């Protein structure tokens, strides 16, 4: 028995099943991605394409990246060239067979890209209708991570596309936060999302600098803005441990394409561990035991036999032997790639981009610098509880809302009751 959809979630599902192209939006942890999974379950799978803007977000819903589905290269080539790319075997069939296109984490899709995809859809499908007649089912939060670009110009938000409102004529909202159960923390997060750091909000975030977020032998994951710093931190902390290194090598269906798998999986080709290593579980092994995607633990031993698999103690108190798992990546043109590896990554540090869409419960962040719009909010809103969060050097300068996004949302609401 599925959880009970809220009335707001039910209204989105109703619209989708009526065939309406929609955008649905809501704060972090309002159940957008969960609702996509419910929508996907409710639809005939033939003709239904599940995508997200990022690899990390696509895996959450069992889908592919928007980039892989589109099959237009970077998207920076001239339109005619993108159309020709979309016409390639495997890519073309994807476009033609698509009746419904799900896109999670839309805030990272820049307007110029959306325009290109819209034009490609019409050309490949030979349908003179918005987005080639595809039913779009889009969600995300424009107050979370901002758009990225494969070019060099300042990206526009997806809603700035001249085709946005024609393509998603209806917007619905999810307004109840579920990730956090604590109303004090819910209200704090909403202040941050809107860029309203009163004296009280700042003091409450500053108070978290004293939080003990870990447990015996488990330390906080430091959320960082850039992968360089993540890598360096994880490598150095592992190097510093006195234990000998235990290695686990991935088995890929096509080892030549290990680079493409590395970019769309949360585990690496070569996993190195020691006693004491700080790790993140990156598969849902057991919701009832708390062994879920994002759970933080520490390696407490290695089995004597066989491969010498790691024993990991998690924040919840469960100690489990971590066995092999598998990922299948839906790459461009219908190609599938798989990787077998243990579902562990080092987690002294993690990038905020890689945390996108996740729930976490043992995190530290330094918020004394200018960040991208929405980026501090994403980092803070990963935590299930305020007591799993440690904010160092907080300054409201870290919390920025792009005025374009506030304007969008205000417009959206103009005719609404609340
Ligand atoms: N109707 C519901 N009742 C109870 N819990 C729910 C409901 N809908 C969603 N959840 C839970 O809400 C939590 C957050 O869901 P999630 O799908 O990650 O939200 P989201 O809006 O996609 N978050 P983000 O990607 O960070 O903006 C998950 O633990 C869900 O199980
Ligand atoms: Mg989500």
374 lines ligand 1 (CB under 6 A): no
DSSP state of 391: E
Q: Token pair of 22, please?
A: 């929609």
* Residue 77 annotated as binding site: no
22 Cα distance to chain centroid: 20
Residues in contact with 248: Cβ distance below 8 Å, sequence separation at least 6, in sequence order: 270, 271, 272, 273, 307, 341, 342
Give the pairing type, strands 251-252 and 48-52. Answer: unpaired
Q: Token pair of 306, please?
A: 């066989």
* Residue 32 annotated as binding site: yes
> 12-45: string of b/e by CB count within 10 Å (b at 16+)?
bbebbeeebbbbbbbbbbbbbbbbbbbbbeebee
Q: At what angle do helices 7-17 and 32-42 cross, to 10 degrees?
A: 40
* Backbone phi, psi, residue 412, to 5°: -55, -40
Q: What is the spatial distance between Cα 70 and Cα 95, in angstroms, rounded to a whole number?
A: 8
125 Cα distance to chain centroid: 30
Q: What is the spatial distance between Cα 64 and Cα 330, in angstroms, rounded to a whole number?
A: 5
Q: What is the spatial distance between Cα 306 and Cα 342, in angstroms, rounded to a whole number?
A: 14
Integer distance in angstroms from the first to the last C-alpha of the chain? 32
140 lines ligand 1 (CB under 6 A): no
Classify 244 as helix, strand or coil: coil
The answer to whether residues 175 and 30 touch, using CB atoms and an 8 Å cutoff, is yes
Cα of 30 to ligand 1 centre, how many Å?
5
- Identify how the structure was determined: X-ray
Atom of ligand 1 nearest to the CA of 178: 12
The answer to whether residues 389 and 416 touch, using CB atoms and an 8 Å cutoff, is no
What does 23-79 look like in DSSP terms, one character per residue?
EEEESTTSSHHHHHHHHHHHS-STTEEEEESSHHHHHHTT-EEHHHHH-BTBS-S-H
Sheet holding 22-26, edge to edge: 64-65, 48-52, 100-104, 135-140, 22-26, 170-174
Cα of 155 to ligand 2 centre, how many Å?
22
CB atoms near residue 113 (< 10 Å): 27
Atom of ligand 1 nearest to the CA of 9: 1
The answer to whether residues 218 and 343 touch, using CB atoms and an 8 Å cutoff, is no
Looking at all shown ligands, the one closest to residue 52's CA atom is 2
382 lines ligand 1 (CB under 6 A): no
CA torsion, ordered 149, 155, 160, 166, to nearest 10 deg: -10
CA torsion, ordered 327, 266, 94, 163, to nearest 10 deg: 160
79 lines ligand 1 (CB under 6 A): no
Question: For 283-405, where are the E strands, in sequence order?
Answer: 296-302, 310-314, 319-321, 325-330, 336-341, 344-346, 349-351, 363-366, 389-392
The answer to whether residues 195 and 399 touch, using CB atoms and an 8 Å cutoff, is yes
Atom of ligand 1 nearest to the CA of 378: 26
Cα of 60 to ligand 2 centre, how many Å?
8
The candidate with the shortest Cα–Cα distance to 179, out of 353, 389, 344, is: 389
Atom of ligand 1 nearest to the CA of 57: 25
11 Cα distance to chain centroid: 24
The candidate with the shortest Cα–Cα distance to 193, out of 207, 209, 211, 180, is: 180
75 lines ligand 1 (CB under 6 A): no
Q: Which residues does residue 100 pair with via DSSP β-bridges, in sequence order?
A: 48, 135
| CA-nearest residue, atom 13 of ligand 1 | 179
Classify 104 as helix, strand or coil: strand
* Residue 28 annotated as binding site: yes
Q: What is the spatial distance between Cα 76 and Cα 97, in angstroms, rounded to a whole number?
A: 25
| CA-nearest residue, atom 1 of ligand 1 | 5
Cα of 29 to ligand 2 centre, how many Å?
7
CB atoms near residue 395 (< 10 Å): 16
Looking at all shown ligands, the one closest to residue 144's CA atom is 1
* Residue 253 annotated as binding site: no
Residues in contact with 221: Cβ distance below 8 Å, sequence separation at least 6, in sequence order: 278, 280, 296, 347, 348, 349, 350, 360, 362, 363, 364
Spell out the alpha helix ranges (H) of 265-336. Answer: none
Residues in contact with 185: Cβ distance below 8 Å, sequence separation at least 6, in sequence order: 383, 385, 386
Cα of 356 to ligand 1 centre, how many Å?
13
104 lines ligand 1 (CB under 6 A): no
Q: Token pair of 391, please?
A: 């904010």
* Backbone phi, psi, residue 315, to 5°: -55, -40
* Residue 151 annotated as binding site: no
Atom of ligand 1 nearest to the CA of 141: 27
The candidate with the shortest Cα–Cα distance to 64, out of 340, 335, 282, is: 335
Q: What is the spatial distance between Cα 257 and Cα 243, in angstroms, rounded to a whole number?
A: 32
377 lines ligand 1 (CB under 6 A): no
Q: What is the spatial distance between Cα 298 and Cα 279, in angstroms, rounded to a whole number?
A: 6
């Amino acid at each position: 028995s599925r959880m009970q959809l809220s009335e707001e979630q039910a209204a989105v599902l109703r619209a989708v099943l009526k065939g309406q192209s929609i955008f649905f939006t809501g704060s972090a942890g309002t159940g957008k991605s969960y609702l996509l999974k419910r929508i996907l379950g409710s639809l005939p799978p033939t003709g239904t394409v599940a995508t997200a803007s990022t690899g990390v977000a696509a895996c959450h819903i069992g889908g592919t990246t928007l980039h892989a589905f589109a099959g237009i290269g970077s998207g920076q080539a001239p339109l005619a060239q993108c159309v020709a790319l979309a016409q390639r075997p495997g890519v073309r069939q994807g476009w033609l067979n698509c009746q419904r296109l799900v896109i999670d984490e839309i805030s990272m899709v820049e307007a110029d890209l959306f325009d290109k995809l819209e034009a490609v859809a019409r050309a490949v499908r030979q349908q003179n209708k918005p987005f080639g007649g595809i039913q779009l089912i889009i969600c995300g939060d424009f107050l979370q991570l901002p758009p990225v670009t494969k070019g060099s110009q300042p990206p526009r938000f997806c809603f700035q596309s001249k085709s946005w409102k024609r393509c998603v004529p209806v917007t619905l909202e999810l307004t109840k936060v579920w990730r956090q159960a604590d109303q004090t923390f819910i209200s704090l997060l909403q202040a941050v999302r809107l860029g309203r750091c009163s004296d009280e909000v700042t003091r409450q975030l500053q108070a978290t600098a004293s939080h003990k977020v870990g447990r015996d032998g488990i330390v906080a994951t430091r959320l960082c803005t850039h992968q360089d710093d993540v890598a360096l931190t994880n490598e150095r902390r592992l190097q510093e441990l006195p234990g000998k290194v235990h290695r686990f090598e991935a088995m890929d269906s096509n080892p030549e394409l290990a680079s493409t798998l590395d970019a769309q999986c949360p585990v690496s080709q070569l996993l190195q561990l020691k006693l004491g290593a700080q790790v993140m579980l990156v598969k849902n092994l057991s919701v009832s035991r708390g062994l879920v995607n994002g759970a933080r633990g520490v390696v407490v031993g290695f089995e004597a036999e066989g491969r010498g698999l790691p024993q990991v103690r998690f924040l919840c108190g469960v100690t489990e032997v971590i066995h092999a798992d598998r990922w299948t990546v839906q790459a461009t043109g219908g190609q599938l790639l798989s990787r077998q590896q243990l579902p562990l990554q080092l987690a002294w540090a993690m990038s905020i981009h890689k945390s996108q869409g996740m729930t976490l419960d043992c995190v530290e962040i330094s918020l004394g610098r200018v960040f991208a719009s929405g980026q501090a909010y994403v980092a803070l809103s990963r935590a299930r509880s305020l007591q799993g969060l440690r904010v160092l050097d907080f300054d409201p300068m870290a919390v920025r809302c792009d005025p374009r996004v506030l304007h969008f949302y205000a417009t959206l609401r103009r005719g609404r009751s609340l």
